[PDB]
Amino acid sequence: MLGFVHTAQRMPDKRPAAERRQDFAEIYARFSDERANEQANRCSQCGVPFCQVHCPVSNNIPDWLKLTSEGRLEEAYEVSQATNNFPEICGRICPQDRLCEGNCVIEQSTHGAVTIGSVEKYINDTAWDQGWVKPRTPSRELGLSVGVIGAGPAGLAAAEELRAKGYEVHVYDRYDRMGGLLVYGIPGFKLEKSVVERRVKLLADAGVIYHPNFEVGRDASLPELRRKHVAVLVAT
Amino acid sequence: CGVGFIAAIDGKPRRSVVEKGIEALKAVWHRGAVDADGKTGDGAGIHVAVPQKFFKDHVKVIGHRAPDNKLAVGQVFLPRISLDAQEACRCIVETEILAFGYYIYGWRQVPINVDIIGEKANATRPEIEQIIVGNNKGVSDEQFELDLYIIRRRIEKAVKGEQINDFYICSLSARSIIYKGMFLAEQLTTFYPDLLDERFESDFAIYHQRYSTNTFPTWPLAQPFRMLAHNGEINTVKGNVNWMKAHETRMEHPAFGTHMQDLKPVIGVGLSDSGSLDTVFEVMVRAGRTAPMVKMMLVPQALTSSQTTPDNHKALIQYCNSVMEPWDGPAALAMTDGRWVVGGMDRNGLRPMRYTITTDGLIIGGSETGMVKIDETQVIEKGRLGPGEMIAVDLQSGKLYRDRELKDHLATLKPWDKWVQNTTHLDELVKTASLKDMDKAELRRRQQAFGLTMEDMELILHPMVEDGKEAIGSMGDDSPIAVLSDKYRGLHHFFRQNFSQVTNPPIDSLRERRVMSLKTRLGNLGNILDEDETQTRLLQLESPVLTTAEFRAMRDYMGDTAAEIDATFPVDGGPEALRDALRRIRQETEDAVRGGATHVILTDEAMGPARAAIPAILATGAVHTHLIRSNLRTFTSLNVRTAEGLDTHYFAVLIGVGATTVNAYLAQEAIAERHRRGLFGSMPLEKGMANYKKAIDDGLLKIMSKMGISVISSYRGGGNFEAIGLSRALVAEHFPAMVSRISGIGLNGIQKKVLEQHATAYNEEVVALPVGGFYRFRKSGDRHGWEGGVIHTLQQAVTNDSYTTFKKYSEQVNKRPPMQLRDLLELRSTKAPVPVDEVESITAIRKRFITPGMSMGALSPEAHGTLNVAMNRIGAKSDSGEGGEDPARFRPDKNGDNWNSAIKQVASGRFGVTAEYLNQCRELEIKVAQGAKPGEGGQLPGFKVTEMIARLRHSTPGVMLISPPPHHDIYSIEDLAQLIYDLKQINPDAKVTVKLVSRSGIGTIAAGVAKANADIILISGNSGGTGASPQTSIKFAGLPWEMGLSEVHQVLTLNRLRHRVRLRTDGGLKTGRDIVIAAMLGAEEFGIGTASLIAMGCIMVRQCHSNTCPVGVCVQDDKLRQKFVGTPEKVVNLFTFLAEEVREILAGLGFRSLNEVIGRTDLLHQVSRGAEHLDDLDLNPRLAQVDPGENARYCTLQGRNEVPDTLDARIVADARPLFEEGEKMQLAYNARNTQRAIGTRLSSMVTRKFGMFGLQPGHITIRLRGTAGQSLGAFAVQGIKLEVMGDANDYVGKGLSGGTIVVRPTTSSPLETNKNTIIGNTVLYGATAGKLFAAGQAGERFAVRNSGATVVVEGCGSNGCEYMTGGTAVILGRVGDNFAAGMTGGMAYVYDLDDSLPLYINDESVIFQRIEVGHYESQLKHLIEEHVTETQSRFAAEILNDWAREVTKFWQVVPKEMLNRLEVPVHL
Amino acid sequence: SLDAQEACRCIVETEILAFGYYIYGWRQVPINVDIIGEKANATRPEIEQIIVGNNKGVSDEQFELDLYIIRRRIEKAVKGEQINDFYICSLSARSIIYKGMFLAEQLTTFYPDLLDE
Amino acid sequence: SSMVTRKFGMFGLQPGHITIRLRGTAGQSLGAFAVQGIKLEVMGDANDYVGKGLSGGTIVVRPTTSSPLETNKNTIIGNTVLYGATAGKLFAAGQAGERFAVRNSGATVVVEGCGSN
Ligand SMILES: Cc1cc2nc3c(=O)[nH]c(=O)nc-3n(C[C@H](O)[C@H](O)[C@H](O)COP(=O)(O)OP(=O)(O)OC[C@H]3O[C@@H](n4cnc5c(N)ncnc54)[C@H](O)[C@@H]3O)c2cc1C
Ligand SMILES: Cc1cc2nc3c(=O)[nH]c(=O)nc-3n(C[C@H](O)[C@H](O)[C@H](O)COP(=O)(O)O)c2cc1C
Ligand code: SF4
Ligand code: SF4
Ligand code: F3S
């Protein structure tokens, strides 16, 4: 299942600038299914994997790589989203040229890095369409009060983890739309807001409490937020 | 070293037998080790009959009237330094003899001459005396001997009751006498002058010359024993002792009587293996059987499923296999009862045996053939002993018995076929009964309780289900040892598999499966002295591994005889719950076995959230040891159902502990769960289970063969393992005899580990197993030795020359938490620091490191050349490896580049060995085993071997090459000494070096190799790398090099032999701290190896075997080789950095060179962790210091060791006209069997002068008269001719390269040419080119590993042309058994006369047919014509005469891979 | 020999641990063999020390009596295997013994441990 | 240099055929009369008369890799460097001394700052 001997690296697609110059959607297309089965077959399962050690979350890349190379996308999706939250957006925004795809042993030998981010995007795409995703709601709710400040990625991930534990989470933010700067800071040109809306609705479905359009500086303060919960998280 | 025997066929005693025995012992001085003192020896012995006339004359001179019936003589060794102990021994023996009403005549002091014994052996000399006993009761002589034997036993017991040391009864009997001692071989007749009277006469005489292994002697342990004279070793000495201790409780026979109670512990304490063999042999013989019967019942013949053997012999083999466990091992036995005299071999037939029959009714057998002087006009037949065969002489009727007729006479006695059919085998019983399932959540919970991964589980198990072979690793181990591993680990990781290195060579399970058997018996244990039909009434299973169905069949067959025992302990129990559970199960098992039930089955199915599972290893060990100590194991079979075992090592360690059958069920349910989702494709579950069982069988066979044991019944319960990190009391109470050199965790730690794992498994709600990080690195856990950051740091530091970066590297490496033993040692001193300038120069340190060998087949030629260039540039010694070397590299380049290799290897393959390849060196190295694959030898994949590799190794392109595990020319330490003699003969200026692997019990091996005139020892660690090897062999084989190094240094300076060797090590030497600590422990040189590879470009991808290394180090394809990045300067920078780091450490310590620190072990201390909860590992036995005395701790001598000169000197003086003018020379000489390596130094001289193909064939011609010694014409280059009249000993033509050797019986010989053995075993080992026209039969393993040579012989032994690769072989006559095993190249022509070839030949990878094309017929005719022209063989001429009808008589054999590569198809 | 040393170590360890006392470890006594004659160096055995702690929290008299019983049991057990030259000089918590075959004038230069303050 | 001159002559070996590294402070007259094929590299500083009579060889001076100094603002060699050299190279890093490269003819020298004359 090495593959990289005779095959060649090929990106999903790229729309030419003749018509790309005017739209605001993404310039990359979904990965073809047979292209997915071929490109996944490109890694060599390098012992002591450098691909993982540089990915700041250090998810299990070669495992789902092998899986996608052979199939069983449900098992691969499960083992992918186990240790990484928000994979759909992380695999799309993070600069893999220096984080994960910038140190694969295939690239270091000048052969051409295996497209890791594209396979991450693909495996997170088809998994959601057929609906192999359920909100991680807890059982036997512990019972306490916890709150976060700022709906950014850090706050959202913290809230997801705490709701999976079984606390009562409260999200505060200044903006009217939730999701940190993914809906206001990052341009839609590089990331469609549809997937962020989908993920944030999934998060809300788990039992997360929202408090949109709030400020800790004027409307409230630190003693108030501290007394209102057990502990307060600051992701401003 | 060697045995021998002489017997009179008719049976009339005479002086000639004893005289010939003395003469034979006078000419075995060249096999045994040579001492420079000229006095000391290993111990010799002779065994003859009692000369009644001499003793009658003696007692008559004393005054008594000589009685008319037979007398009896008893030889005793009493203490000498004291006086009171002598009186005690004398009164003991006198009262014990006079307790039986016998009559005692008197004592006798033996005159000796003690001036010839050395001063080391004279210190422990016992007072030797004899006692004379008559017979006043007039009883028969059989009862006389039996009473004498009982008296001897009771005397031994009584004197053991008083702790009177150094007392030994040699032989108390009325028929035989034994003269043995610790002198030399020749000087025997000058120490015992009693053998110089013309009155001594005997019809049989046995003699032995042993080969000691330690400089310290011991008189009571010299051959021959009271009933035996054995040569060789014993692989199964623990299992047999344990099983005999089990059998002791039910041995009763009316032949003994009440005194039977005195003979309970038959196997005494503190005796050698052969001693135990002798004592059990005598105990069985005194019961009533005949000597051939017990010999066949102790060392049986290898039962094969063929049709060459009749059915009576088959029934006999089945009976003897069902009676008693075998005793495997290389053994050449020459045993004698009072009536029979038998001589035979073991199952495998390793050690040779050759005999001669004279017209005077005299048979002479021995290890060599030219020992005694016999005229050619007196012999009738010369024969040899094959596998398991035996030759006997009956003295009463005065008859001779060869193999077939003796076996028939033995089968004549009892109706075996009326008893063997009383057995039962579970194939139809399970098949007929078979034709008459768990939740994934609970499965995951149980797997998490036992801690099985997900990635690795389906990585090592998947090839077993899909393909049926265990997975193949790619690089060395670096995971920490078990005791320091943070995460949970099973019990099986704490056990390392043993393996024999030199003292007994392994057996190749891939090519010799015929002597391999996995049969097991249930309900066969009974009285060992009784014979009846009831014995062979049992259940027989073809494989000890059982699935669920077979287990249900066996259990519901046993019915009510079974008794289950729960193997779980309460989780809520206190700190001592585990010990209480152990005691509970022991008591339950004892009571159950007492309660009539005769079968015990361990089970842990009740595992759940309330009770935890007892480890299976500990449970079965406790149960088996308790049953042995309670004398109840002989009534009950033991079965275990484990829920953890997945790989072959677990089953191996579960069987070795003492189990019989196991059914690891959880593997089966996991496999079924995998198959139900459709992952294995279209394979039905039946095929999956079949492949799983087959893979487990093959793996277990491999682990057994790794130490030379071919029978499962003797390996069971032997305890052949090693514990590294268990408490001493634990393994000494609840485990069989196994040594743990360092103490480890006791009971509390194990209970804590199992409890924490159980809690993290059940008490939570898990979903999926962890990713697992055992075999490959993952971010979860399981810390390794080489991670990403450290690799990048080393590479950047070596490519940028920034020594500060290398210091940062070293700090990063040393900062990691403990992972090896060498991370638990601190170093301190007492003197003041010394500035770094005073430390010796860097170059004097860099010239010490070496680069271990790496086969050219493993890694691409670019890396090999780069390493060679760099190392030869800095001045050190690089290494070549097993794959040979290209000749075009034997000269320096134009740019001052030296691409040659300075150290050459002589491995077990002998692939590229050549007379020219052995002179382009400075030091030769001998390979025994390495740290990754200590038993199975190096292997090379199929798609790796290119055309260049085929040219280097003289082989066929694109074929799987696997090297034979055992050195076919090293079957004993004497073979090692002979091989070192050979190597030092062929190269007049190089050094020799052995290569061992660190394991327990290496001290005796160290002393032996030091006595074998070696130069440099090499202790290789257990974490070395490799090109390819099985995974289990990588993970669980070997021991840390600190243990081996400390043991070797201690045992080698204790014997005052340190000033003649140079110790060198490698394995996991990453930074300078490790090098300094190793130098302190006793090292003198250092090998880096794998680290250097990473400096060259490797990034530890662990895909060496897949031919797809992305960097381009280990690949043979052309494209990937372009991706190389190495440079000869990076290795230079790495070695410079290492040297500077060692310099800094030494300067900070307070010394000025490594010479002042080697052996100064007192500098070290052991620190430990406080809250680690680990029971402290006592490292003191490794830090113990023994004082060498006057000799320095590192003392050495310049130049290689000396060696006596052979005939070759006398040859190279007379041949001076050739070396000075190139004129033809023809010589003749008389060669005795003592002269070794005939015609080798001349080969070296003529290679250095002219070359290999420099002379025309037949330039120098030599003729020899008599019998040539072993290894005749080793490495005979083209241009030399050697014609010897007589016979050769063995190894003739070893490594032949272009020469021409011819043997023949002399013209005065009245024998038939094609019915008499003329050459010995393993002829033409690794031959490359030349011709060999022989006239006579050949020994065992004929033309093994032959590649290129042209050989014509008349007959052969078993396993002929084993692993053949090239050349032509023409056998005229009967072939042995299992002919053409694993043949891959060349072609063979066998002379058929009885159409019996298909019964014998092996059709694995070869095809046989009739001769078809006239071209090959003409070539065969040319070969036969040349053979006739050379030796004038009459039978060859008679074959030639009838060509028209003899053309269609032969059979042609060709490999299955040379068919389509042929230039002219053999088939029309 | 060396294997006999391992048997002796495991004997004394499995007999001390049968009562409950926790072993701290061994210690090799640093000696200086050079001041030994010839007839004595031929039969000089290895000298080692073992350290045991009283973690049971028992009075001194039961400790001494238990160590005496341990010594007798160890002697009997090792006699059971007929091992030669194994001698426990003194095992207690009140006194220690330094004895040998050297002269009387070189004692302090044979066992340097006796020169510490 | 004398040995290789007797063996291969003045220009018998290609440049860099044998290289030597020196740590610390070299003494006087470093590389006196070194023929082509020799290469010397000293880490530290040379005393005086360095490279005298150079004919074809190669000398290299340089502060060690841990130097906190400034290269072109310190002295690294002595006086009368390359007195009457014929051929070869001399690469340094630092200020030379007085009488730098007097009577030079054919050599190639590269220095960062020098002294009078
Ligand atoms: C391809 C790429 C492009 C990128 N482009 C950009 C870019 O254009 N701009 C950029 O900044 N980063 C950019 N980044 C970086 C990255 O997007 C941000 O660093 C990251 O999203 C910040 O996460 P956060 O945890 O700070 O969340 P944030 O979204 O920063 O969390 C802040 C949230 O808290 C709210 N808040 C702020 N103050 C208060 C307060 N006092 N009380 C209550 N709520 C408050 C804010 O309204 C907001 O909703 C880019 C990264 C990549 C890989
Ligand atoms: C890639 C590779 C190939 C090797 N090939 C051989 C070989 O052919 N023969 C041999 O005896 N040892 C071979 N070895 C083992 C080395 O000779 C040496 O024993 C070992 O590398 C030392 O341990 P280390 O891993 O710490 O360097 C090989 C090792 C490696 C890594
Ligand atoms: S990027 Fe390279 S090291 Fe990482 S998984 Fe893929 S092939 Fe293996
Ligand atoms: S692109 Fe994917 S693999 Fe790379 S760092 Fe981001 S999440 Fe990890
Ligand atoms: S891991 Fe193996 S494939 Fe080459 S790069 Fe290293 S030797």
CSV table of N, CA, C and O and ligand atoms in Angstrom, one decimal, chain A residues 55-56 59 61 84 90-91 94 96 99-101 116-117 120, ligand 4:
chain,number,residue,atom,x,y,z
A,55,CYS,N,2.1,18.0,13.4
A,55,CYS,CA,0.7,18.5,13.5
A,55,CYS,C,0.4,18.9,15.0
A,55,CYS,O,0.5,18.0,15.9
A,56,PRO,N,0.0,20.1,15.2
A,56,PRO,CA,-0.1,20.6,16.6
A,56,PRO,C,-1.1,19.8,17.5
A,56,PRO,O,-1.0,19.8,18.7
A,59,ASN,N,-3.0,14.2,15.7
A,59,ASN,CA,-3.9,13.2,15.4
A,59,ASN,C,-3.3,12.0,14.7
A,59,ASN,O,-2.2,12.1,14.1
A,61,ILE,N,-2.6,10.3,12.0
A,61,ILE,CA,-2.7,10.4,10.5
A,61,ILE,C,-2.6,9.0,9.8
A,61,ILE,O,-3.4,8.7,9.0
A,84,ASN,N,-9.5,15.0,17.5
A,84,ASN,CA,-9.4,16.3,16.9
A,84,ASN,C,-10.9,16.8,16.8
A,84,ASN,O,-11.7,16.2,16.2
A,90,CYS,N,-10.4,22.7,10.5
A,90,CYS,CA,-9.0,22.7,10.7
A,90,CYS,C,-8.2,22.1,9.5
A,90,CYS,O,-7.1,22.6,9.2
A,91,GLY,N,-8.8,21.1,8.9
A,91,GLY,CA,-8.1,20.5,7.7
A,91,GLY,C,-8.2,21.4,6.5
A,91,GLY,O,-7.5,21.1,5.5
A,94,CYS,N,-5.8,25.4,8.1
A,94,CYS,CA,-4.4,25.3,8.7
A,94,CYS,C,-3.4,25.2,7.6
A,94,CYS,O,-3.6,24.5,6.6
A,96,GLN,N,-1.0,23.7,5.9
A,96,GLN,CA,-0.3,22.4,5.9
A,96,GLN,C,1.0,22.4,5.2
A,96,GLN,O,1.8,21.5,5.4
A,99,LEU,N,2.9,22.9,8.6
A,99,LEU,CA,2.5,22.2,9.8
A,99,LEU,C,2.5,20.7,9.7
A,99,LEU,O,3.2,20.0,10.4
A,100,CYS,N,1.8,20.1,8.8
A,100,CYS,CA,1.7,18.7,8.6
A,100,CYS,C,2.2,18.2,7.3
A,100,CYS,O,3.1,17.3,7.3
A,101,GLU,N,1.7,18.7,6.2
A,101,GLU,CA,2.3,18.3,4.9
A,101,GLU,C,3.6,18.9,4.6
A,101,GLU,O,4.2,18.6,3.5
A,116,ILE,N,-2.5,15.5,2.9
A,116,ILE,CA,-3.1,15.1,4.1
A,116,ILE,C,-4.4,16.0,4.4
A,116,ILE,O,-5.4,15.5,4.7
A,117,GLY,N,-4.3,17.3,4.2
A,117,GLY,CA,-5.4,18.2,4.4
A,117,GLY,C,-6.6,17.8,3.5
A,117,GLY,O,-7.7,17.9,3.9
A,120,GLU,N,-8.3,14.8,4.8
A,120,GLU,CA,-9.0,15.2,6.0
A,120,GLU,C,-10.3,15.8,5.6
A,120,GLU,O,-11.4,15.5,6.1
E,4,SF4,S1,-4.0,20.2,8.3
E,4,SF4,FE1,-4.8,18.4,9.4
E,4,SF4,S2,-3.0,17.2,9.9
E,4,SF4,FE2,-2.2,19.3,9.3
E,4,SF4,S3,-2.1,20.4,11.3
E,4,SF4,FE3,-4.1,20.8,10.5
E,4,SF4,S4,-5.5,19.3,11.4
E,4,SF4,FE4,-3.4,18.5,11.7
